[PDB]
Amino acid sequence: MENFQKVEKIGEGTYGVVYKARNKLTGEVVALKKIPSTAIREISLLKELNHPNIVKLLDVIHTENKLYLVFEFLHQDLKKFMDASALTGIPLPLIKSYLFQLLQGLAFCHSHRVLHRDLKPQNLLINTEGAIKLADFGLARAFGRTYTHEVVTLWYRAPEILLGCKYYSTAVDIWSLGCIFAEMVTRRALFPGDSEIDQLFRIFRTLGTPDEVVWPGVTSMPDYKPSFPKWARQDFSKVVPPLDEDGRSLLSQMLHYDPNKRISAKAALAHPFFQDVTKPVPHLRL
Numbered sequence: 117m118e119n120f121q122k123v124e125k126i127g128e129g130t131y132g133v134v135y136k137a138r139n140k141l142t143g144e145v146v147a148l149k150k151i152p153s154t155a156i157r158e159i160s161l162l163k164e165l166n167h168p169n170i171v172k173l174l175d176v177i178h179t180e181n182k183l184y185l186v187f188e189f190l191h192q193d194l195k196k197f198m199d200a201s202a203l204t205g206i207p208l209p210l211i212k213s214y215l216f217q218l219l220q221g222l223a224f225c226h227s228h229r230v231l232h233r234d235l236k237p238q239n240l241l242i243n244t245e246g247a248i249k250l251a252d253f254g255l256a257r258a259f260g261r262t263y264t265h266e267v268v269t270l271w272y273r274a275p276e277i278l279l280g281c282k283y284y285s286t287a288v289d290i291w292s293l294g295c296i297f298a299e300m301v302t303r304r305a306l307f308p309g310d311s312e313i314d315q316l317f318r319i320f321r322t323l324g325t326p327d328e329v330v331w332p333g334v335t336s337m338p339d340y341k342p343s344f345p346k347w348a349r350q351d352f353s354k355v356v357p358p359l360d361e362d363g364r365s366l367l368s369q370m371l372h373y374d375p376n377k378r379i380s381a382k383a384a385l386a387h388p389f390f391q392d393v394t395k396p397v398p399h400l401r402l
């Protein structure tokens with residue numbers, strides 16, 4: 117760490133503090149995250165998982181029982197960009213470009229059997245060129261409230277996780293990305309739960325209480341209760357106006373209850389919603 121000069125604190129992650137820093141050897145500006153042997157091996161496998169839509173893991177430094185992850189630096193996150201675009205909304209061509217790029221990122225990681233598990237706007241990073249990249253890919257499998265006691269958000273958690281499936285699939289990331297897509301369109305979180313049951317019931321109130329018809333095996337899941345209230349499903353036309361029919365079709369497939377029915381990232385890239393995809397330049401002031 118004597119090779120790095122901390123510039124400023126940029127955030128507080130799930131695992132630890134994130135700093136903007138300068139590498140004294142190469143002159144490189146980086147993001148530094150301050151965090152057992154199985155974790156070292158798993159994190160080292162992530163240095164190989166390189167893609168233009170994945171924030172690059174430059175190095176892993178293990179010194180004096182402290183773990184530092186050195187990443188490529190990006191100047192803004194999607195949470196801040198959405199907050200900044202609250203009054204006007206992010207233009208549809210830019211939402212479409214970001215969704216397409218994130219699906220390319222997911223298709224790559226999923227093809228290597230790597231899941232993110234905790235996608236949220238805070239870990240989607242953007243640059244001036246129109247790119248968007250996934251941060252913290254693979255860290256959940258390695259490390260499992262934050263270190264500052266901040267509550268870890270449940271808003272993007274898939275229903276199978278909330279229902280106690282411990283052997284969940286790549287479909288959990290498609291659910292989270294569908295929640296983010298809906299939030300970019302409407303300018304409001306889709307399911308802003310503030311407890312596990314509030315999160316589940318917000319999902320049920322919009323998509324209908326799941327049953328054996330729509331999700332075979334649901335009633336036998338660990339945290340499923342026959343006493344859950346039975347809510348009827350809402351039309352997507354009410355949930356995400358003014359999204360067009362192609363976008364609503366794709367969103368519905370990303371939010372299917374059964375993880376086996378939920379669209380894969382690869383199949384989502386072929387959806388007609390992306391027929392007219394482009395790569396616009398966002399409005400960024402840094």
Ligand SMILES: O=C(O)c1ccc(C(=O)Nc2cc(C3CC3)[nH]n2)cc1
Nearest residue numbers: 126147187188189190191192193251
């Ligand atoms: O509002 C701002 O100034 C601002 C600046 C930087 C960021 C940001 O998280 N950057 C990062 C993080 C990472 C990897 C995952 C460690 N790389 N780059 C977010 C907001």
